[PDB]
Amino acid sequence: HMSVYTVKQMARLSGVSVRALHHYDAIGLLKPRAVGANGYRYYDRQDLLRLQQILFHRALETPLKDIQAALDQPGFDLAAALRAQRERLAAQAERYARLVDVVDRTLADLEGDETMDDKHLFEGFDPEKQARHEAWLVE
Amino acid sequence: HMSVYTVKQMARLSGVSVRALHHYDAIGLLKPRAVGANGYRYYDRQDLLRLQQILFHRALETPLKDIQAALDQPGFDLAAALRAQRERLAAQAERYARLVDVVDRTLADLEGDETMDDKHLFEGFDPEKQARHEAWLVE
């Protein structure tokens, strides 16, 4: 809330390194807002929430330049951004949980009479991740 | 089980493109084993299980060359490989579910008195994904 943090403290609190925070600072992505009377710069609550936004974007494989754009958007609403991120994180949790179900079904067939239909081997894989890989194979 | 598939059929069944399967074939990753009397090559059940292994590896961001190595390992046990993949897929599902919890806790603080401790903003992020990004920032 009123707490403010040096780079050393922000690293320890967030798990982002001092190296990364200096880089995020240099490129205008995350600049410590709070300034003391000694000219030192400190991360405040608003900076912590922006860094959390950066970590959510990276969890969701958003590329570094796209992050700046998304955060600096005029009329940026943090609660809206969080709800959109929730939906995409939930969908990733459901994909991974579906892929465990596929492993479970495959193991049981495999240690059973091996009668399970072939198509059931392949339900659950991310079509998006396949397109980005077939596109790569065309070099 | 006894079913065998052309490239066109294997694409339709698996969701992998004809382009990718020809590439997987060329580089020795997945070569249709079953051969007919007309010299044509067909994917059998064992090929379907190897392709499922490739799709699990790609879900778990294993690099293409590492896949060959892992599948061609002497004493390769498919049920062992599946159980190891289960554990890593489950862990990804738990990470994504934890990140939704973090969003939920943050939203409720944000629309509340904003008293939640700062450290709670940052629990749940993948430290591995952070190291691979701080390492990248050193170019």
Numbering used by the authors:
A (entry chain A), B (entry chain A): 0 to 138
Paper text:
The TipA (thiostrepton-induced protein A) class of transcriptional regulators found in diverse bacteria is viewed as a minimal autoregulated MDR system. TipA proteins belong to a subset of the superfamily of mercuric ion resistance (MerR)–like transcriptional regulators that contain an N-terminal helix-turn-helix (HTH) motif followed by an intermediate linking coiled-coil (PF00376 MerR and PF13411 MerR_1 families in the Pfam database) and a C-terminal TipAS-type effector domain (PF07739 TipAS family in the Pfam database). In addition to S. lividans, TipA-class proteins have also been reported to have crucial regulatory functions in other species such as Mta (multidrug transporter activation protein) from Bacillus subtilis, stationary-phase regulation of KatG protein (SkgA) from Caulobacter crescentus, and AlbA (albicidin resistance protein) containing two tandem TipAS domains from Klebsiella oxytoca.
As a result, diffraction-quality crystals of SkgA were obtained, and the structure was determined at a resolution of 2.5 Å using the single-wavelength anomalous dispersion phasing method. The established structure consists of the N-terminal MerR-type HTH motif, coiled-coil region, and the initial two α-helices of the C-terminal TipAS domain, whereas the rest of the TipAS domain was still invisible in the current model, probably because of structural flexibility or diffraction damage. Because MerR family proteins reportedly function as dimers and SkgA protein also exhibits a dimer conformation in solution, a dimeric SkgA structure was established by combining two molecules from two adjacent asymmetric units for subsequent analysis. Remarkably, apart from the coiled-coil α5 helices, the α6–α7 region and N-terminal domain are also involved in the dimeric interface. Fifteen residues of the α6–α7 region of each protomer interact with the N-terminal domain of the other protomer via hydrogen bonding, ionic bonding, and hydrophobic interactions, which contribute to stabilization of the conformation of the α6–α7 region. Eleven residues of the N-terminal α1–α2 region exhibit interactions with ten residues of the α6–α7 region via hydrophobic interactions and three hydrogen bonds formed by residue pairs Tyr4–Asp117, Ser16–Glu133, and Tyr23–His132.
